[PDB]
């Protein structure tokens, strides 16, 4: 049913951009809150930026750790979520996941398998 | 920003014993509407995290009864009546009602004796 797949991460050089993507399957993509959580090989899960559904005018909020660099977006026709990351760095190397809110008080009801990024060579 | 501070860092248990993870916020985590978007997740070794309890105490469909959360305020606590081997992993509490949304540092739930 619900399928969330990420892709676009890889080995990048300090500074410089990259564009992550998440494909959707099994749900009217437009009616749901979406996010990007990040877990550096290190430890803790870290919410980066979130995008809401048509019901909420597709608003968007970001952590400050990516406030100006990273930028979220959503292809409502193709049902895909993107995360453009710019001037990457060290603390950026991590497995980036895709998440979709639940019809109730829940932000991450469905996570993707996650895609890894490594920046520091 | 309001950070979550969950303890203990590591929680050793024998399969079958109850387990209790705490999560002290650092300030009221009540949204403008009436909710407290405090959630729990279980990330098993090398495996995306799962949603366990969304509002301070609702149990996400598919998660077994063993799990339950609670305690509105600044102190929230996740409890598991009997811990199966498949419960072992790292639990994180997530604060979802105040931007910048935050996670706890986690609390590994490994086998004790």
């Amino acid at each position: 049913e619900v399928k969330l797949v990420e892709s676009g991460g890889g080995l990048v050089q300090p500074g410089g951009s990259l564009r992550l993507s998440c494909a959707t399957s099994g749900f009217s993509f437009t009616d749901y809150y979406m996010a990007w959580v990040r877990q550096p090989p290190g430890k803790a899960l870290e919410w980066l930026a979130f995008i809401r559904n048509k019901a909420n005018g597709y608003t968007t909020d970001y952590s400050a750790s990516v406030k100006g660099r990273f930028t979220i977006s959503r292809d409502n026709s193709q049902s895909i979520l993107y995360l453009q990351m710019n001037t990457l760095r060290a603390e950026d190397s991590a497995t980036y996941y895709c998440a979709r809110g639940d019809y109730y008080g829940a932000w991450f009801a469905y996570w993707g398998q996650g895609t890894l990024v490594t920046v520091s060579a | 920003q309001v950070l979550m501070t969950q303890t203990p860092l590591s929680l050793p248990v024998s399969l079958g014993d109850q387990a209790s993870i705490s999560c002290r916020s650092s300030q009221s985590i009540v949204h403008s509407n009436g909710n407290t978007y405090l959630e729990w997740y279980l990330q098993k070794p090398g495996q995306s995290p799962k949603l366990l309890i969304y509002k301070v105490s609702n149990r996400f469909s598919g998660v077994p009864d063993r799990f339950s959360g609670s305690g509105s305020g600044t102190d929230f606590t996740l409890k598991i009546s009997r811990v199966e081997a498949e419960d072992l992993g790292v639990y994180y509490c997530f604060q979802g009602s105040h931007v910048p949304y935050t996670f706890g540092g986690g609390t590994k739930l490994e086998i004790k004796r």
């Binding site: 050089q13 300090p14 060579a121 | 920003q1 950070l3």
Partner: peptide
């Protein structure tokens, strides 16, 4: 490195 390469709110 390869080619051509309190305080809380």
């Amino acid at each position: 490195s390869t080619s051509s390469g309190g305080g809380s709110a």
